[model samples]
Target: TAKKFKVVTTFTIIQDIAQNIAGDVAVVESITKPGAEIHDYQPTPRDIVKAQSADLILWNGMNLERWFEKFFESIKDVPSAVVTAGITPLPIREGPYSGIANPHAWMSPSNALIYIENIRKALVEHDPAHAETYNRNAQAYAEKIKALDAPLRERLSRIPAEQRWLVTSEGAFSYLAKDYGFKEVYLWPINAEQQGIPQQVRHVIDIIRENKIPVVFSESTISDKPAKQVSKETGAQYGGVLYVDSLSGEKGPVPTYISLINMTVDTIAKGFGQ
Candidate 1:
């Protein structure tokens, strides 16, 4: 059958999931473009105007999209789903936003399972005729997601508990770190706040120096220089960029959601292995 609906996702990560579940039942697109910084993404007037055509909108709802309420208000009455609805968010553990909900729930594969279920239910509710296909796709994709857990745990466990410190330029790993065994550290609590400040760098350098944590990392959507600076000053290795906010283009290593999560965990494990 020809595509019957338009599914507008807030960013590429959810777009990938919705497409996987929706199959050809709908056309899924991200409101934000590839490699866009989602936390501080302010949708333009054109974005809202374009959103008018969306049959159903989907977004990661733990406050990751800072412009959520504003943008949705511009395009009112469109049915939407908060993909993170049923998951308990980990609180931001540092900086000005401390104690607020950390919205990068999609970083954790475990949380992503919930996101898959949420997307499945939303698709089935919106287009009931294809419920069987959606259900089967979600179940199959979920098994692939579930398979990552064993290897993820095994590799992460290899990192010494003392050095299981997952430090990055943005504190986007709260959920991933919690689900795995790493303790989270970052230059800033979230991207929306002032980033790459001297104090933020100093604090992380202190952590590295004190704990002798050997590696630091950054995200694909943000600059790696701050993390490089941290590595220089603290004598830790600057681990590679991790994908979180958006997926790579079709030609890139993490073009799909599954590869995005897999590559992220694999990168972290290999970096800390150094």
Candidate 2:
């Protein structure tokens, strides 16, 4: 029997998403360790060596990987798939990366289906023998993704439109904000930009006050301290944690891609609903 197609991903979230679509047909592995900062993740020689054997590499492209060029150069021969390939990007509205693609397309459940389609296509093309299995898994997973929206939308809809601001440390929630009718305000455009600076803090504080945003939050992959500071000075409640770039460990609240997004949606809804 031939070896199972090996699909290596950039981080835990994508790893889980890919595994969902690949099912038992492919083995999905993430290069960055759980809870690591994926934007600035540096792949090791061992990581590259591991990638050298992968049959396919699935990544959330759109310039999310700060060390992407180096990794791409080293893995030139491996077949790579961009999960967000067909999705149109939303340009950053502010900060250093104002005009560039936001790179957090997977943050939205609607866009996540597109990712599943892309992954399914990649897998079917790579391993035709298991094409039927991939198609079945993708359909099942897409249905699950579709099911998440109704409850999430109902919950989020309860928040008064005036308080629908999702302030975070990184501006990675544009897609989610757009999908769920929330406005995104962040300390920085991307995690690759400097975090926890006074300027960034001050800017968000201004937004919180101007918009009367009641709750502020941060991602699981970055420090909540800046958001904490914003909350303290602005008198906004800290909205606990939101995960976007990565997923939590198996023992934690957000172990899978669906869970990661659902938990985030729940957090925002509960934070602002009151």
Candidate 3:
């Protein structure tokens, strides 16, 4: 069928799901590059053109894509789907956006199942001809998602209960913390939210000191300077970056989503396991 339409998604997480069900049925253009921040993403002209001309646009909506109004307004008449629509939105839990449910739902494989269902339904709606293929592929990915949860729970359980917290640049891991266990010391609702604010340094430093946490983690999307400063000021080891909302480049340590989580566990184990 020559892959009839191009599907443009806002981030790599959605892109991963689209690739699963669509397989070769649709060409998926992920707007945010590997390790890029979706919160502050500035779409290139190429990205706009792709979204404007897409058969379907998929995203995790709920103000997570703070730029949603602009992006969707720019595409006034296009077909787009908020892939997390059916799942109950998460409460913000911490940082500047605390009390609001987080939008990074894919951090948990359970919520990710909702993402898959949403994507599969959208695929069926737009391209009924390949619905069965989408159905089968969605199921296959769902099983793979199921397999990861138990191991994460077991690894996380070993961390001393008081020290079982995750401190990172963004609150993106809230869902993961909720599911697998760990409280995030997110400086901003998301890192891009922190980049311009000097006070973010003081805030994270305070968390590190109060909790007596030994380390703080960086993230691929954020500049390491602020986190590094917090580490220097608080004496918390500056742990390596966590692949929260995106995958690594093809040649990097975490070229895929599952690999990203494996890397995250290793990072956490290094700190909390110690």
TM of each candidate vs. truth: 0.96, 0.96, 0.90
User: What local lDDT score does residue 160 receive in model 1, on the 0 to 100 scale?
Assistant: 83
Model 3 bad stretches (over 4 Å): 93-98, 192-199
lDDT of 2 by residue, 1-274 (tens): 4678898988887899889988887899998987899988888999998788899988888888888667868885788888898898999877667788989998888888899999999999988999999999999999999998888888888887777888988888999889878878888888875888787888889988898788998888888888888899986999998888888788988899888877888888778763
Best lDDT among the predictions, by candidate number: 1
| lDDT, candidates in the order shown | 0.87, 0.86, 0.78
Better of 1 and 2 by lDDT: 1
RMSD of 1: 1.3
Instruction: Tell me the tens digit of each residue's lDDT in model 3 across 127-185.
Output: 88888888999899888878888887788888887887788877678888877667777
Q: Candidate 1 local accuracy as lDDT?
A: 0.87
Identify the superior model by lDDT, candidate 1 or candidate 3.
1
Q: Count the backbone clashes (under 3 Å) in each candidate.
A: 0, 0, 5
Candidate 2 residues lying further than 4 Å off, grouped into runs, are: none
**Sort order, lDDT high to low:** 1, 2, 3
